[PDB]
């Protein structure tokens, strides 16, 4: 018996999250994610590591997807249709009904994998409910625990014959507004994969409302690029409640092909965490962009990739009073990275440069686990080894010393494509 993990991505990095828990004689694949940086075949995880030149995979017993972020779901159609795969794919109900929307939006932005592939990739999906031990064929028992960090995220407990593994993925141990804290019983696994995005690490929320209000009054518009789900519903309660507690008259347009999703999200929210129309929100069209008065427009996509957000940004750029509150990480190559990086000029369709003078801002909303949260989780779970995969190299190196100091455990930080043999 020897547990082997060989991350095909997201080891001393972020994105392309893919871990191969080859253990107990039964191959298991953890999250299957894409990397929205590279545009070559490196965009999806390298699958020649398992079966070279073989377009069918018959080695993995089950594929487990934690949550719907596109660094844990975007390669799932490619893993299930181009490279063949017909076995089970276990994932949670809200992630199950939220993932197709995001995958379809990513398909529209990137133009390669057709809607038929999206449908066929998720006719295979099996949904799992929390705290319900469900078994793949024999002695591969999977349990799911409530995680946080997004709607319908879970962290999984895999048992193959007296060898347990707890894969966290994404979690958040601090109490919060949107979703609470993850919970774990006193299972004592022989491993605990974890997250280390915030190893080194109210004020991120007040500075959103208090800034957008002080920017809309001066006759300046506000643009908030978001994806279809996720962070776009973190804010559309704060803005609506802020403009209902205080009576305001400015419009907040909402990018027409998005509003019915805001009902599905809050329909699932009240089921998960424990018809719907908004008061001051009205969907808008391409004609409203040139109108003179103030507005607060939500739009898609969320990194200024291409689409509605870029055409809005191409017209509101030269004005001084306008602003662009990007709400999430912008990966290399999006117009978002150049703008968040101090570019004051960005190039466009025919040698045209929009001289950005708008006041770009950046506010992170992800709510991962900080430094104290991971030791709290270890103290709840008490594993035999610890493994850190999601995040940057130096922060994990610093966290390893603290883990070894406090709990006397080991800690492994594999690179991309490096098996980490763990003994008993």
């Amino acid at each position: 018996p020897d547990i082997k993990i060989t991350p095909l991505g997201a080891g001393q990095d972020v994105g392309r999250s893919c871990l191969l828990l080859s253990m107990g004689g039964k191959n298991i694949m953890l999250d299957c994610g894409m990397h929205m940086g590279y545009n070559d075949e490196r965009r999806f995880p390298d699958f020649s590591y398992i079966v070279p030149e073989g377009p069918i995979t018959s080695h993995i017993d089950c594929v487990i997807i934690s949550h719907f972020h596109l660094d844990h779901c975007g390669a799932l159609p490619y893993m299930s249709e181009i490279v063949g795969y017909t076995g089970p794919i276990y994932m949670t109900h809200p992630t199950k009904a939220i993932a197709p929307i995001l995958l379809e939006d990513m398909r529209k932005v990137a133009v390669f994998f057709t809607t038929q592939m999206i449908k066929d990739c998720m006719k295979k999906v099996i949904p799992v409910t929390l705290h319900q031990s469900m078994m793949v064929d024999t002695d591969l028992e999977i349990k799911a625990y409530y995680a946080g960090h997004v709607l319908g995220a879970a962290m999984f407990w895999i048992k193959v014959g007296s060898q347990s593994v707890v894969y966290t993925g994404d979690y958040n141990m601090t109490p919060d507004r949107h979703l609470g804290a993850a919970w774990i019983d006193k299972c004592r696994p022989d491993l605990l994969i974890s997250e280390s995005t915030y190893a080194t690490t109210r004020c991120r929320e007040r500075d959103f409302l208090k800034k957008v209000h002080e920017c809309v009054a001066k006759g300046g518009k506000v643009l908030i690029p978001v994806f279809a789900l996720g962070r776009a519903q973190e804010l559309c309660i704060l803005l609506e409640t802020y403009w209902e507690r205080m009576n305001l008259k400015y419009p907040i347009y909402f990018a027409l092909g998005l509003t019915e999703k805001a009902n599905t999200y809050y329909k699932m929210f009240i089921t998960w965490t424990n018809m719907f129309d908004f008061k001051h929100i009205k969907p808008f069209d391409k004609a409203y962009i040139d109108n003179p008065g103030a507005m607060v427009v939500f739009a898609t996509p969320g990194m200024l990739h291409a689409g509605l957000s870029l055409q809005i940004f191409k017209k509101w750029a030269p004005n001084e009073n306008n602003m662009v509150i990007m709400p999430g990480y912008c990966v290399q190559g999006t117009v978002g990275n150049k703008i968040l990086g101090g570019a004051k000029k960005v190039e466009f369709e025919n040698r045209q440069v929009v001289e950005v003078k708008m006041a770009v801002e950046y506010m992170s909303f992800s709510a991962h686990a900080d430094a104290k949260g991971i030791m709290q989780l270890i103290q709840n779970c008490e594993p035999k080894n610890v493994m850190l995969v999601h995040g940057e190299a130096g922060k994990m190196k610093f966290l390893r010393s603290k883990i070894k100091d406090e709990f006397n455990l080991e800690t492994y930080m594999p690179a991309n494509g490096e098996t980490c043999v763990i003994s008993t």
Binding site: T6, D13, V14, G15, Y38, N39, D40, Y49, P52, G54, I56, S58, H69, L70, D71, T86, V111, K119, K123, K124, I126, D137, H149, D170, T197, L209, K210, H213, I237, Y242, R245, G257, T259, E260, F269, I270, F276, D285, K286, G328, Y329, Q332, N337, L340, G341, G342, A343, E349, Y362, S364, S366, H368, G391, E392, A393, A415, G417, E418, T419, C420
Partner: protein, 803 residues
């Protein structure tokens, strides 16, 4: 010219790299540079005299000590040296300088290089070893022991699959260039040493690693198309079979014996190819192969048996054209290809059967040497069935024509017996589906398709398993309908109607797919015998469940089904025309977001208008909604479908001296009054997408040759911040159709303006702009500007986060 500019930028960033202090996350940049140095267009930036000087300076900065001189720049340095090593001039400049020697010594004397320096160094070794002088240096330096060290011990598994290729390339090139056998013997003895030395659980790792490396070498020789002397050296000096058969004697493991058996089998095939090529019957391989399979019988192991049979099949297919397909084993005419698949299929048939009823018909394909081994398998007697099925369906990449038929028949038998754990069922159904749709196994090839449809009907009908198998069953029924065409009707009658009312999404969408397939069959291809099956109750339930089923893919599938089954006369005359269908389509095409279904609603409308008639009262609303369906923020598919509608309408209406001139002028007048030229102008000058532009350009071009002739605010903030969103929604919970029939009037531009406003505006520039900008978006210079900005700026609070 821009070349000096980009070279100066690269000079600046390379000068930045060498500085002793460095801290840069976001690895992407490095790989980006490497890819952008691989492209042949940048081939001048390696020819410039700057890069080799940088490599020399970095190496003389790393060789004396690099405790911390370069964290990750070294990997880029070695990859850049490997990119340099292509022979135009760089090979002799690298040779005259101490770069490659220092790199090899650096790789040798280190101890814990992270597995990205190793792959870079091995890439350098591979790039240099293809040339003769590189091989001369490698022979001088005694480098191979490092490669054995890597391929034996390290954990990377992207290194070993790259190290072994260099190793085998040295072995083959040294053997086949007529060079001394001293070096080849030393390499082979160094590989062979952990086995010869042994003739717990620690030495077994070395044994398994060297066995796997030897099997890789032998299989790569098996690919070869030329006679080589490596196999005779392996047999003579370090006699291989005897040592391996002595190795199997003591150590015992089921997982470890698969490696010893694959190296033995690979050796047998390599010996065949490299002894029969130059010094009849193939008995020498025959007795060895069959006593090997007999030993697998006697060891009583299942998974290793099917894996070994799979790999024997793969290797025999890898021999290729130089295989007679008929081996004279001992006075017999025994075709080899069939016995491999007999050995492969037999564990499945024996496992699911439990005394023989169907295998006895199969075994006449096999010859006596296989019959005796099968009859000792039966006396020789877990989840083994699905593993065998997955092995069989792993073979399907290389399986020519008739073995596909045989394995399809065997899977049909195992499905028939399984019908009369669901994992074996799902596996066999998937495998049968993929083999049928790949190898064209239509009704003449299969024997008992009636059993297929009957058992599928029983599966769909009487037990109601989990939904992961029902979908595959409906896909199988779809393949059976559209390929096994020549009972079925009364079986498919009620099960379609019951499954269209299933609780889950995954079954209803698939049932709609099957229904539209059998409706498309009911056209001229097949008689109306299928129509009266549909004509019972299907078009009402399809329409009234296309109305509202609250899953978007279901409504999409139902709309495309209803588009397919509306152009057949019997259904429309009987039970479809009574329902007002065009009203609901008009409502969907405007007042419905989630425009995956709007496009297919447009398709359904196109079929209805083209092949039927609609009432004269709907035409104004029809054209108004159709004009709206393209103008405005819509996805590409809806716009493309609506333009297809307009093109079809224009051309269809167009086929209806002075008299022809007046009639044609009336035709253009009728099409412009509803508005078609103005909407093309507004879509051409404004809409930004890729394929809509080429579609409009080709449409207008094809048209234009037939056309030109004729305090207070903080208490609310702290009140908002002190309650969860589950408590801002309890309060939120607790507290038109058919657009006006003259929307098109504004888009009524006459023909005369369509002369001028199309004459002025450019045409190819519109399609050129959005593609040229994408080509120039990720040019080399843009990447250098971005990486300069990334290096100069250091914002610690910007964290790479969960996308």
């Amino acid at each position: 010219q821009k070349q000096e500019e980009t070279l100066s930028r690269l000079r600046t960033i390379f000068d930045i790299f060498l500085r002793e202090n460095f801290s840069t996350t976001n690895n992407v940049y490095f790989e980006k540079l490497l890819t952008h140095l691989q492209a042949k267009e940048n081939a001048f930036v390696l020819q410039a005299p700057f890069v080799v000087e940088w490599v020399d300076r970095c190496i003389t900065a790393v060789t004396e000590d690099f405790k911390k001189i370069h964290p990750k720049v070294i990997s880029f340095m070695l990859n850049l040296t490997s990119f340099l090593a292509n022979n135009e001039w760089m090979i002799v400049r690298l040779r005259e300088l101490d770069i490659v020697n220092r790199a090899v010594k650096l790789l040798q004397r280190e101890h814990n290089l992270s597995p990205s320096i190793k792959l870079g160094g091995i890439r350098l070794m591979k790039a240099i070893t293809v040339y003769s002088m590189g091989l001369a240096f490698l022979r001088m330096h005694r480098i191979w022991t490092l490669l054995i060290q890597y391929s034996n011990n390290d954990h990377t598994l992207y290194v070993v699959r790259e190290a072994r290729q260099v190793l085998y390339n040295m072995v083959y090139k040294s053997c086949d260039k007529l060079h001394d056998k001293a070096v080849t013997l030393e390499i082979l003895s160094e590989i062979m040493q952990p086995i010869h030395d042994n003739l717990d659980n620690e030495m077994l790792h070395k044994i398994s690693s060297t066995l796997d490396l030897l099997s890789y070498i032998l299989q790569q020789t098996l690919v070869l198309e030329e006679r080589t002397t490596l196999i005779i050296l392996l047999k003579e000096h370090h006699d291989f079979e005897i040592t391996v058969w002595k190795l199997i004697d003591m150590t015992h493991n089921p997982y470890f014996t698969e490696k010893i058996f694959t190296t033995l089998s690979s050796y047998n095939f390599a010996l065949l190819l490299h002894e029969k090529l130059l010094n009849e019957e193939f008995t020498e391989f025959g007795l060895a192969f069959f006593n090997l399979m007999k030993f697998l019988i006697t060891r009583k192991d299942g998974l290793s048996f099917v894996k070994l049979a799979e790999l024997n099949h793969v290797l025999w297919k890898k021999l290729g054209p130089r295989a007679p397909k008929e081996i004279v084993i001992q006075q017999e005419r025994v075709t080899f290809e069939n016995q491999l698949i007999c050995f492969h299929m037999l564990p499945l048939l024996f496992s699911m059967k439990y005394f023989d009823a169907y295998v006895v018909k199969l075994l006449e394909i096999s010859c006596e040497q296989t019959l005796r081994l099968c009859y000792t398998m039966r006396d020789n007697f877990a989840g083994l069935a699905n593993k065998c099925i997955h092995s069989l369906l792993a073979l399907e990449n290389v399986l020519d024509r008739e073995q596909a038929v045989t394995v399809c028949q065997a899977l049909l038998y195992v499905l028939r017996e399984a019908v009369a754990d669901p994992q074996v069922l799902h596996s066999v159904m998937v495998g049968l589906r993929t083999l049928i749709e790949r190898f064209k196994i239509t009704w003449k090839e299969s024997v008992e398709t009636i059993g297929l449809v009957n058992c599928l009907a029983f599966v769909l009908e009487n037990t109601s398993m989990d939904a992961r198998c029902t979908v595959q069953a409906l896909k199988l029924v779809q393949l059976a309908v559209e390929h096994f065409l020549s009972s079925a009707l009364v079986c498919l009658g009620p099960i379609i109607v019951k499954r269209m009312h299933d609780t889950m999404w995954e079954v209803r969408d698939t049932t709609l797919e099957l229904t539209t397939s059998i409706a498309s069959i009911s056209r001229i291809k097949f008689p109306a015998f299928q129509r009266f099956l549909i004509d019972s109750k299907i078009p009402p339930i399809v329409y009234e469940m296309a109305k509202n089923d609250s899953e978007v893919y279901v409504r999409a599938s139902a709309f495309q089904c209803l588009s397919q089954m509306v152009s057949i006369n019997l259904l429309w005359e009987n039970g479809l025309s009574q329902l007002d269908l065009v009203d609901h389509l008009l409502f969907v095409m405007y007042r419905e977001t989630n425009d995956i279904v709007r496009s297919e609603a447009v398709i359904t409308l196109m079929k209805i208008y083209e092949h039927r008639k609609i009432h004269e009262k709907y035409k104004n609303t029809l054209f108004s909604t159709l004009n709206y369906c393209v103008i405005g923020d819509h996805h590409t598919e809806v716009k493309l479908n609506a333009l297809n509608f307009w093109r079809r309408e224009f051309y269809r209406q167009f086929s209806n001296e002075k008299e022809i001139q007046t009639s044609i002028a009336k035709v253009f007048g009728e099409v412009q009054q509803y508005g078609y030229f103005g909407i093309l102008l507004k879509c051409l000058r404004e809409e930004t997408s890729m394929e809509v532009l080429e579609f409009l350009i080709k449409g207008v071009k094809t048209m234009t040759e037939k056309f030109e002739r004729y305090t207070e605010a903080d208490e609310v903030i702290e009140s908002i911040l002190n309650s969860q969103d589950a408590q801002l929604l309890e309060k939120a919970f607790e507290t038109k159709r058919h657009i006006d029939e003259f929307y098109y009037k504004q888009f009524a531009v006459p023909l005369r303006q369509f002369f001028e406003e199309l004459k002025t505006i450019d045409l190819d520039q519109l399609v050129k702009q959005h593609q040229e900008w994408f080509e120039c978006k990720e040019n080399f210079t843009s990447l250098l500007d971005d990486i300069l900005g990334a290096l100069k700026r250091d914002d610690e609070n910007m964290i790479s986060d969960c996308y």
